[PDB]
Symmetry: D3
């Protein structure tokens, strides 16, 4: 990798965007590396949680405009660059975005792709694409709208204005806001805690929530219960309930 740095801490995989010189602008090259890194941690049974964060002042301020400026519809159609983003979407391992600073355009879309977001008090979110004559192309218009409704989404998408971490939290986009200096510490504590929950349960609960977003209630509940059944084939379910009935600490193993 030449645009990111990855490391492991316990059962948590950490991915740091490493292009602070350009505020970690997400180039097609960088996105490719990020996906490769996420998929690698996902495949690794030892990594139960993945954390994304930015090196320097920003999380990710937009995408690389330079490599985009002269493109045309046909080149983009053949390129199919958002297929890399779709790969991120189907990763089943829990993912947390630790937004240390500016998260604009592609940067905001990268954060929205994660399951949880812990934001620095100094972080700001937004989609300035409209002011460049374009629009978000990596799910920004879709994920934002499902989270806050069309009335509010259009106001941010049509203006390209900057949203504060505090407002993102009130809107249900961000899970927690913490001081810049405590961001990583808080995020790692959360990740460590999640890595201690039954791995199968997190996995299947994540799938259910994803179906809940799209699926009609009845069919979503249909999918939900099938996952419920599957959990009773796991040792963690037997132990979790046995422990509950025996007033003792449960000992999970991810199987």
């Amino acid at each position: 990798f030449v645009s990111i740095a990855a490391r492991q801490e316990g059962a948590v995989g950490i991915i740091e965007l490493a292009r602070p010189d350009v505020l970690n602008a997400l180039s097609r090259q960088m996105v490719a590396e990020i996906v490769a890194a996420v998929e690698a941690f996902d495949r690794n049974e030892k990594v139960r949680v993945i954390v994304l964060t930015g090196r320097g002042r920003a999380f990710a301020a937009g995408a690389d405009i330079q490599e985009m400026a002269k493109d045309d519809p046909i080149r983009l159609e053949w390129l199919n660059q958002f297929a890399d983003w779709d790969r991120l979407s189907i990763v089943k391992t829990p993912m947390i975005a630790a937004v240390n600073g500016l998260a604009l355009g592609g940067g905001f879309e990268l954060a929205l792709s994660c399951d949880l977001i812990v934001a620095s008090s100094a972080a700001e979110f937004g989609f300035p694409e409209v002011n460049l004559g374009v629009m978000p192309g990596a799910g920004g218009t879709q994920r934002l709208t499902k989270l806050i409704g069309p009335k509010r989404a259009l106001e941010w998408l049509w203006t390209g204005a900057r949203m504060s971490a505090k407002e993102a939290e009130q809107l249900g986009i961000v899970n927690r806001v913490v001081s810049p200096e405590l961001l990583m510490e808080e995020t790692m504590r959360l990740a460590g805690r999640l890595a201690e929950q039954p791995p199968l349960a997190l996995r299947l609960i994540k799938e259910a929530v994803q179906k809940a977003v799209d699926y009609p209630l009845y069919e979503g509940m249909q999918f939900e219960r099938k996952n419920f059944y599957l959990l009773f084939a796991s040792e963690d379910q037997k132990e979790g309930m046995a422990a509950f009935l025996e007033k003792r600490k449960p000992r999970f193993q991810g199987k």
Copy 2:
């Protein structure tokens, strides 16, 4: 001795179902769920019952489900059992349903409250899905109803941690309609229930269906369904009376037809 885990009674045009197993904080067993379903469907069929209220006896609404009866289950037993079929039955009751949450509403308990149309909570009530900490997950619509109500980001946080949510926060999130003092719970609920019982029966019924469609259906198709119910309402005497009273600047007198 109709039921063994619940107690049902009718007050005016309001049917009331009280979970009756406070010795176990009203833990929802598969048996209890079956009784709740029978009671609700009966109140639904009763032309005299226009609103159904669900509440818990004791200090808890329902604190989880009966773990002992499923602690040793396997996928096969559960597949043939199809226990959630009973929950789907509650889901399709057309009569308005209100949950008066008097305390702990966890796991299956939270799902029962979410199954209702409106939720009046005691400022002392707590909500949550502790299932993950038992090695499993909500299986009666919990992951679906909570996500639709508060979004995936917030939903996953609660579902993955199994942490308890306060009534106040539940209200801020649009999960709970109103929060009141513990001693005033059943009063606020029965008053709200009584007020709804005075609304045009057909209108409440059809508005409920439409809202349910609005959750699943794409806008255009949801609007196509909405208008069909709108047309149907003009075949009722209540529509004639309601609009007349409106034009005649007088209070309408509905009858339910």
Copy 3:
């Protein structure tokens, strides 16, 4: 001059449609709705009009629908009338639309505002669906749009009670974009409209389409649609200009092509 219920005018790149029956609080009759749609579609097709503004003359935006004309109707008459097909036409207008709610916006009035992309409300504006109290229900998307915006628990309370919502509450719920003093409404709205009219026209257009799909489409398919619009924008002069004007650090000049 064949517009007896509304008045339309243009200022720069902004088209303004003013409901003109203050004598009856701009009650939405089938005739008035038909006129609104005709004017909006004309403004929509006119590429010189980049933003459309709807507002009411007098104290109200639109205080419900014409009930007298509706009072004696029956299901069959409503079926052949298919009056809501006109509302569907408003739903597909591609030009950005803003509702400047100067006052009461009840029933159809609330549905008219909800049909717009953004809502700027006077602090004196009140919203609501009193239809239930008339023995009916909203029939022009009210139950659908409200539910998608605030969830079923909260939507059902407003729909079942028919209570009035304040402009302040509507803003908190994410229904209204901003609240301003009565005497500043049109100034604020026209200001906003003017600004929007300066944004790259194709971007606003395709972004609006993408957002509409986001409400209905499952995430994966919505994203598939989104990127196709992303591709298309790179065939526009504004995209080349916008990005060039960004790398060169200068003011971009947009033309809508």
Copy 4:
């Protein structure tokens, strides 16, 4: 029961409409009894397949017109009589319709509600509702359209014309057409064979097929594989694959 007669034979449950005096016209009470009978057989783990057929010359020719001739929309709305048909729709046990003669209106919808249809070469299908001033109300317009397309669906729904058993078979509505005196023989044979297949596999395949009708491919496949996973918790899967590998006849048990 007053309008139907139920009996068991091997692992097959038989429900015979018993009102030939009126060609088994489907009244609301009759549908209610059919549902009760089907759910009972469904619950009875001794019955692995359910067969529906009509006593006399007809399977079911329409519904009870006299019963609803004076109904209004409000009466029908509160009645919610099609909720009984919805109940038939969710029965998980395999169901087969043995159509002996006329299967019109509700009768045709009753056949379409089943999973497979075997019909006498003398049987006829159709929706004459249009000629009574109404339309099919128990899934007829929906199930027919999904099987043969809107162009052909409208042709039959708008005219109310009668379709020959042979035409239905060619359209993919009817699975098999046999001579009148062999209808029950062929149907019971088929029922027996299916009763010998692994019950869980039939059950889960039936759910998947139902989802294939209503789900976009990607999501349908998501549901499909979850059912696939579930079957590996069964003894029938182990035995089924073992027998295949051991080139011997399998002995399934429904678990």
Copy 5:
């Protein structure tokens, strides 16, 4: 109207494409006229059926080639010409296409937009656009696929080959095939019979069938039954069922 000719006859509205010199090539202007005419007939409760046909030897040999030569992406986006095609899609009055000859590209799409298709023996269908490096843009890919499946649809759409009236009938696309000189007479006869069917029944059955094409079964049945209820508010339902019981010929009034 300089591209089409509209006229009534009985309770049947007739629309004739009138640019035989150019084989009725569908131009934006012509489509605009077709929409105006159809919507006028739709709103008129005196016209119970609408028939579309072409003058000369063809139904419609495609779209206006001049448009295809002048159009560009942005221009097309602003024109939103296919919105007019969407209007045809929601016409509630029964519509019949009498294909008198070539129905290629937009021509095929126009025919597919009708509820039923009566074709001449010499009529041929197809989407040759691919050969010009273009694709159907008026529902062709959508409607063809829903009628014959993706495997078969892709062959026709990818090759651009012509389909015979006979094969179309076999595929359930065309409802009936007749000789060239009996086309109109046979179509007007069918239109006449349909015009005698209960108007409300036809209207609501059409709505239901349209939902069946898209809706999941359960939701479709939900819509279907609401329309069922509504029909019991009409005099035609009471007259139809009463007449059926009284053994008399019903007199429907469309109310």
Copy 6:
């Protein structure tokens, strides 16, 4: 590769399943190779068509049963083997399956994953999974049901019986049936023809057909017209028009 052989002839990529010793039984490793080969051909803008066929007497006769005979649900859940099949599903390059022999289970599902199927008159299709105590887990229940309807799909899925090439073609599953010895000749001729068509048009048409299968009509058409617009940004669209007005053969370059 150890289970397949990839070859490039002109603008056509050919993948030969090469484990005739086991009738090309599809193991998880083999599927992985197929995906790798297919995606490689897909990315190569010099390969316009991909053909899949089986070495030996069978195309692929089921999956590797030994490999999964003792698997449990948890093992399968973590494995997520069908994610490889989802990758096949999203390949945008045209794909044709040349079915030489038996195409059972995963084999049938592999053929179904292709856009077009040319089969030997001696080939047979089927889903024997049910007879092993399981069910198809790679889209079989989904794709088959969408192609032939729930009545006919269940018949085959519940019985596991083998379907002839002839019937498959009558059902709309198979595009063409030819003499065993002419299988590749025909397939390569079809492949050669498609290779001559406009690459972008085939690509965007394929996407539209895929939407048509799932999407409701109105939304499918909104997607369709967007692709329609994009094609007018291609040089091939101009070349297509030019070649026509000049009455000559067009030379498309995929731009």
